[PDB]
Symmetry: C2
């Protein structure tokens, strides 16, 4: 297994993993599938922001991917990012999520980001454990803020502070 930066050529595999998350999981709270061109667009936008898109690979097959984006739109949140880590359903129970997330955190420090936030369905105990093991702490428990598959969903935020330096000048 290796983890590397994604290329344009990885976007078809990313699309499959994204669409799986969308249709068959509560790991992303979006409802419709996209095409490869859409994930290329998304990929380019991330590149434009200087944000990382990582893939895990095994025997030349993309087994997972990870990225982060801005957590919120306003200026004041510009050092807080929110991650997305998705593992292909043929490839979990192999610790790829944690390895992807660890690498992502490193990239977040290179971008000077101050906090990484994870948005986790509150009932996902496995994800909560994985995040605790990387030093994340639970800072939100928000009932019924989401909706999917005919039910209201509860959201947990967890976060990890990435440095103890001062904020930028006024």
């Amino acid at each position: 297994m290796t983890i590397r930066f994604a290329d344009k050529a990885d976007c078809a595999a990313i699309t499959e993993i994204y669409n799986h998350a969308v249709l068959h999981t509560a790991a992303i709270w979006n409802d419709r599938t996209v095409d490869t061109d859409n994930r290329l667009a998304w990929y380019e936008a991330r590149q434009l922001l200087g944000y990382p898109v990582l893939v895990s690979e095994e025997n030349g097959v993309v087994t997972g991917y990870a990225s982060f984006g801005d957590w919120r739109s306003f200026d004041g949140f510009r050092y807080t990012v929110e991650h997305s880590v998705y593992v292909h359903p043929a490839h979990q129970g192999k610790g790829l999520g944690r390895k992807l997330l660890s690498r992502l955190i490193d990239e977040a420090r290179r971008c000077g980001k101050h906090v990484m936030v994870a948005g986790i369905e509150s009932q996902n105990a496995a994800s909560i454990r994985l995040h605790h093991s990387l030093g994340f702490t639970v800072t939100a428990q928000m009932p019924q803020v989401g909706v999917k598959f005919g039910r209201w969903l509860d959201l947990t935020f967890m976060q990890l502070q990435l440095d103890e330096h001062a904020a930028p000048d006024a």
Copy 2:
């Protein structure tokens, strides 16, 4: 005092109040001022979404304004809105914030929204009290996620569930 829906003609007054919040408060975590055309643009966009823009008025003067927008971008959050209520600095200690917020909540029910979220600087005890008095509860305490005026800022989320009905079908 009255509260009414805003018009295009209220956008210059809204702009003043917005810019005050931006420059002189930690009530909004944005850093630069905008012009009236920008708030007209923002106003129209809200109208396009069917979302309310309210103003408080006294003797023909706009003393405050309130609106809500989508809390997060993803489909699954489409019944969760986040409010913004700003009172003109010549007009607080008059209970306008709470009155604006109460009216806003009513408008949120008319839009079928299921949860309203407030994002509050954690040290703003007065805002926390005002929200508790309308049935909001604290569901997030997130240190150093924001930045303004040379310091890291802590964010509190509070929320109010607006109905106890079922979610939309799958």
